[PDB]
Design a protein around this nucleic acid. Structure first.
Lengths: 54, 289, 237, 226, 109, 121, 133
RNA sequence: GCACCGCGCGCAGGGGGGCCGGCGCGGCAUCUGGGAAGACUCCUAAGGCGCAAGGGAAUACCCCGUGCGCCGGGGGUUG
């Protein structure tokens, strides 16, 4: 990812970072993707997943 | 013509999803000699981000990106034809503000923001245009708002009640679409399908169809059939009741999928009327319309 | 006692309990908007002890966006006396007079202000100082004053529009020089009043960076204003 | 709840406000002879439905919600005829609807009277709502600002000549209004007219007797004579 | 009430002037770089009592001026509540000495 | 026209008039154009609500200049009669200005309301 | 390659890298009529005296960066050469004004910015009377 | 540097990781607590509140029955 910033105590020196997405697609926001799911499963619970397994 | 051949797959990266897809097709241009140049069709998408992506199907990769200072875009659509060369995308989002992007002459840029809701907790989940200048958006706070795109104003705030089936009082209008005669069809969190009047923007009918929430709608091109796909893996088909006008009723329902029906879209031309419904079991199911 | 600052064309006045910023008045014996002014002479006139030559107008950072940047730790301001600065959003001729006094007589400041009342006060100010030219036109339409503005060295930008980076972009594609300077003041409560201001400022810096500037530094104006940033950046170098 | 309802003047239908506020109120409409649901009319508001009134021919009904939106909803087409706004109402409390020789496609009632929570009761001539298009901002025939507390009761005369409107929260806050002149009668009630804290009023079928019942539980009767 | 309003205007002007003078006396700055190499080069370049008394004095002046303005603002609010309590008709506003808040819902006709 | 920070959404208009009515019961409200101008000039005003139904609209246009000079938020509601009987006046009030104090649930409502007005702007 | 440059005073043309020709002007109240004439794109005497050659169109080209001015001077039949709009012509019309110090010994060996200032004051006061006081 | 017949220890800090546990900021369909709260609701009672004087004290806090006002209860036939 991006190199984390280094603070002298007053100012913050940071490398710019846009080298992640050249031409491919922008990376999906995990906080927004989990919000639309939480509107879909409001209070409802999952059914038990598989067969006979621990 | 019924072959259904999968041509190109353009994969996105890791931690990248695709939520909405919109084709933008120009009208038929004519040459000097009477020959027909058909509409160049451009594909736009969102990826649960603040960025609308335009895809280059010639190079099989993403062509452009556009983003404004707003929340994550959850729904978007291209403005329908009445202008000719000046068509614009309208996109709802999480924090509320209906952003409006411009597309002309191979461009995709964040033009402006029409309006935003007063309440910050209003999330825009679906969008459909009634005419050239009237945008119908569903929201998470039990409302279906009807904005007017030119001045950015608000015609009327349609509302829906609580859900009295479980908790969580706010109903969520997952899918709106517009009939050709002006009415608005909306499937929501209760599994209902509401028919809203077109001139007055009030409801005319509530059709209780599904058990879990209706996730996607589709409307026939002549305005004769409504297909509704929910989270109870259920697909229901409605035709108008004979006699009284504006009254729909569920002809029949059937569980075609094995998981929820998250998206569907219709097509009606060259001797082929289909509606393709894709869900969470990765199998696109083609129904004859 | 008056010393020049690190920035050329900018002076400071020091005392036992204060430290003020000031500029060299181009029209001596005249004030514009009710600002304190100090008269100092160059030494060599002890027998007379009359402050004759240099008149200094006190620059107020509470009414100036740019003077709040200089007292904040602005490393360069990209302008020297004799440069060419385009001022976008010249609100009634408050800061553009101090910028004109920075650039001197061989420099020229091109003020652009769409609003009509501030245009009235701007032209009634600009009659005296001849090194400014005022343009009452919308800054979102640069081809309306493309005849009137030549190539510049610095763009200053304090306009309260949400497409501020787009206004800066079209005015820099039509008027800024190769390797030019941009000093832009960003208002978070104008661009997006709900997001964090750090996120709003980072999105504006990214919009400039894709708009082919090179962000050198960004500093907040927060002993003076609330949720305001100053981005100092260069253009194509 | 089933507390608030209105039976139609033809006697065929009966409308009940459904207790579901949530930014807009609905009311379920029931056939009287078989006691079965036949329709539902939903309006958008902030707290729901303040009041409503059947039209005089018996088909549609006018639903005045809180926050000022008033909605004419027909029974034949079974969707909304129109929506208009009360003038400057920060929230409606009661509505009444009476008279004869009104507009033919809006039920044939002439006057609508809408009383808000501030104390102001607006009276509109319903031939001024027609611009079937309804004007979105009609002007009142008369705005009554005589009562200072929230208008609790309002009742038209069955021949459409009187209008009695009263507030519960003040002792002897009842006024009586002529129509079509829209003038408050000044000779009654006086300082010593034993109204009480007026909770319900009712005009007779021939409109000869006004009955006023207060919060103590005492009905009193007044012959109307012109 | 008129006297308290004039004194509050004077004291608010004094507070604005004193706060301006105190700010003028005494993650803020961010510098961007293209790479870790240029960031480290700038870090190499970075590796290469009177004010205390007068600023404590201006700080004590600022706190006393804020106390004076808050006292005059509370006095003006108390006098507006006295007007509401002595109005010729029943007006809301203010608490009784029992503690119950006065609120009349009548309209001024 | 000249009423560019217009409050057109009826939910926001209802929130503005409900906060006006609560401030009116708290006696934290200045009613009228002259009293609004005095509160904005003195600087005691927290938020200011003008009305757009004024028949000469130019008699309240001086208050946007003083609010631009003093950095207080102003907003336009549609109906002056609604603003008037929201304050509890029985007249048409064309401009109202609601003030702030030390500690109140009303002051928290004022802060949230001017955040919503900044969302309109 | 006829390019069309408009400064506050006059025009220049750089068809054959190096400059070819020019048109100069100074100090009149018809300069604001020139200014309005390119605010719309109307007929202009300096424009017409520039584009009036006697032979023919010899190659149909005239590079003007604003599309409005291009398709408003397309309609003039006085010379019937058809211009081209700004096909992202940033480099040409930016480099000529940044390197316009080379041009200044050619047509007007002077500093002509005082009439630029005067036209700016005239246009701004014209719009201040358009918003009258 | 300590042991040149050894591991290790005292210390400067360069980068990335387990992203283990806390902290901060942000959203959060619901749930829990509080304030506000609809005017049919509560508004403490058939009485209460306010202003200005007067008298007494646990002397920061309070209590009591004179003059002006503001409501409320009860009673109450087109004054």
């Amino acid at each position: 990812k991006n190199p984390k910033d280094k603070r002298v105590g007053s100012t913050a020196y940071r490398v710019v970072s846009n080298g992640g997405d050249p031409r491919l697609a922008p990376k999906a926001k995990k906080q927004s993707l989990n919000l639309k799911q939480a509107l879909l499963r409001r209070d409802r619970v999952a059914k038990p997943r598989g067969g006979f397994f621990v | 013509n019924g072959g259904w051949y999968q041509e190109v797959i353009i994969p996105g990266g890791k931690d990248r999803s695709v939520d909405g897809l919109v084709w933008v097709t120009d009208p038929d241009e004519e040459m000097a000699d009477g020959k027909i140049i058909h509409g160049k069709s451009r594909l736009f998408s969102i990826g649960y981000t603040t960025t609308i992506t335009e895809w280059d199907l010639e190079k099989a990769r993403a062509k452009k990106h556009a983003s404004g200072q707003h929340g994550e875009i959850w729904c978007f659509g291209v403005q329908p034809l009445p202008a000719a060369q000046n068509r614009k995308l309208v996109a709802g989002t999480v924090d509320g503000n209906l952003v409006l992007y411009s597309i002309e002459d191979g461009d995709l840029k964040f033009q402006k923001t029409l309006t935003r809701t007063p309440s910050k907790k209003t999330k825009f989940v679906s969008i459909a245009f009634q005419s050239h200048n009237i945008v119908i958006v569903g929201c998470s706070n039990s409302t279906i708002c009807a904005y007017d795109v030119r001045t950015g104003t608000m015609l009327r705030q349609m509302t829906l009640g609580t859900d009295l089936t479980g908790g969580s009082k706010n109903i969520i209008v997952w899918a709106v679409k517009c009939l050709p005669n002006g009415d608005i069809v909306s499937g929501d969190s209760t599994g209902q399908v509401c028919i809203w009047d077109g001139k007055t923007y009030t409801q005319a009918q509530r059709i209780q169809s599904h058990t879990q929430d209706v996730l996607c709608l589709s409307v026939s091109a002549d305005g004769s059939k409504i297909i509704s796909g929910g989270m109870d893996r259920r697909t229901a088909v409605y035709e108008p009741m004979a006699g009284q006008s504006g009254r729909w009723s569920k002809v029949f329902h059937r569980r075609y999928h094995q998981h929820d029906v998250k998206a569907m879209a219709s097509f009606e031309g060259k001797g082929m009327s289909v509606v393709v419904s894709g869900g969470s079991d990765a199998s696109p199911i083609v129904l004859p319309l | 006692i008056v010393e020049p600052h690190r920035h050329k064309g900018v002076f400071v006045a020091r005392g036992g309990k204060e430290d003020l910023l000031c500029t060299a008045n181009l029209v001596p014996g005249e004030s514009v908007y009710g600002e304190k002014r100090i008269s100092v002479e160059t030494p060599g006139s002890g027998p007379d002890a009359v402050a004759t030559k240099t008149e200094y107008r006190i620059w107020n950072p509470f009414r100036s966006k740019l003077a709040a940047g200089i007292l904040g730790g602005l490393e360069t301001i990209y302008m020297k006396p004799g440069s060419k600065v385009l001022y976008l959003g010249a609100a009634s001729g408050t800061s553009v007079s101090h910028v004109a006094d920075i650039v001197g007589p061989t420099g020229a400041v091109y003020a652009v202000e769409f609003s009509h009342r501030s245009g009235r006060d701007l032209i009634n100010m600009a009659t005296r100082r001849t090194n400014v030219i005022p343009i009452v036109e919308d800054a979102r339409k640069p081809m309306a004053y493309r005849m009137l503005v030549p190539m510049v060295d610095v763009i200053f930008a304090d306009v309260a529009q949400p497409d501020q980076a787009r206004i800066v972009g079209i005015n820099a594609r039509l008027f800024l020089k190769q390797g030019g300077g941009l000093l832009i003041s960003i208002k978070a409560s104008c661009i997006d009043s709900t997001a964090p201001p750090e996120q709003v400022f980072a999105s504006e810096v990214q919009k400039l960076r894709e708009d082919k500037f090179f962000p050198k530094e960004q500093l907040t104006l927060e002993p003076y204003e609330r949720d305001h940033a100053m981005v100092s950046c260069v253009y194509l170098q | 709840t089933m507390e608030r309802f209105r039976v139609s003047p033809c006697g065929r239908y009966m409308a009940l406000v459904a207790s579901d506020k949530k930014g807009g109120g609905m009311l379920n409409i029931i056939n009287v002879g078989t006691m079965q649901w036949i329709a539902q009319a939903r309006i958008d508001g902030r707290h729901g439905v303040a009041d409503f009134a059947w039209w005089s021919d018996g088909n549609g009904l006018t639903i005045a919600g809180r926050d000022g939106q008033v909605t004419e909803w027909s029974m034949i087409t079974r969707r909304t005829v129109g929506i208009w706004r009360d003038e400057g109402s920060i929230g409606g409390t009661v509505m009444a609807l009476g008279g004869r020789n009104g507009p033919a496609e809006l039920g044939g009632d002439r006057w609508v009277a809408i009383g808000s929570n501030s104390g102001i009761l607006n009276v509109y001539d319903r031939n001024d709502l027609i611009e079937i298009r309804i004007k979105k901002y009609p002007t009142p025939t008369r705005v009554f600002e005589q009562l200072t507390t929230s208008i609790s009761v309002v009742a038209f005369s069955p021949d459409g000549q009187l209008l009695a409107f009263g507030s519960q929260h003040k002792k002897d806050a009842l006024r009586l209004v002529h129509l079509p002149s829209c003038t408050v009668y000044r000779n009654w009630p006086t300082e010593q007219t034993p109204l009480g804290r007026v909770t319900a009023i009712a005009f007779s079928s021939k409109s000869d007797v006004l009955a006023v019942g207060n919060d103590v539980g005492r009905v009193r009767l007044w012959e109307i004579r012109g | 009430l008129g006297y308290v309003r004039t004194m509050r205007n004077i004291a608010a002007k004094e507070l604005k002037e004193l706060e301006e003078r105190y700010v003028l006396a005494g993650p803020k700055k961010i510098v961007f770089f293209e790479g870790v190499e240029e960031r480290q080069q700038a870090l190499e370049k970075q590796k290469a009592r009177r004010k205390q008394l007068v600023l404590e004095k201006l700080a004590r002046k600022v706190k006393a001026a804020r106390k004076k303005l808050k006292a005059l603002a509370d006095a003006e609010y108390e006098l507006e509540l006295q007007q509401a309590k002595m109005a010729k008709t029943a007006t809301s506003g203010g608490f009784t000495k029992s503690g119950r808040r006065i609120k009349v819902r009548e309209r001024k006709r | 026209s000249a009423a560019w920070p217009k409050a057109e959404d009826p939910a926001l208009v209802q929130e503005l008039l409900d906060c006006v009515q609560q401030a009116s019961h708290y006696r934290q409200l200045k009613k009228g154009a002259n009293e609004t101008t005095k509160s904005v000039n003195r600087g005691t005003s927290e938020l200011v609500i003008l009305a757009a139904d004024t028949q000469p609209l130019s008699i309240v246009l001086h208050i946007p200049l003083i609010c631009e000079e003093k950095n207080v938020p102003y907003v336009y509601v549609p109906s002056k009669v609604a603003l008037g009987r929201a304050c509890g006046v029985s007249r048409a009030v064309i401009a109202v200005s609601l003030t702030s104090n030390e500690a109140s649930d009303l002051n928290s409502k004022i802060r949230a309301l001017r955040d919503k007005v900044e969302r309109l702007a | 390659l006829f390019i069309l440059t408009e400064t506050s005073a006059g025009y220049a043309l750089f068809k054959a890298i190096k400059y070819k020709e020019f048109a100069k002007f100074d100090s009149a109240a018809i300069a604001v009529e020139e200014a309005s004439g390119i605010l719309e794109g109307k007929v202009t005497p300096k424009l017409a005296s520039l584009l009036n050659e006697l032979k023919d169109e010899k190659k149909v080209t005239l590079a003007v960066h604003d599309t409005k001015l291009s398709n408003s001077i397309t309609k003039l039949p006085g010379i019937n050469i058809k211009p081209i709009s700004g096909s992202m012509t940033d480099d040409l019309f930016r480099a000529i004004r940044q390197h316009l110090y080379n041009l200044i010994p050619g047509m007007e060996p002077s500093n002509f910015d005082e009439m630029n200032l005067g036209l700016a004051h005239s246009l701004s006061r014209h719009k201040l009377k358009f918003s009258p006081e």
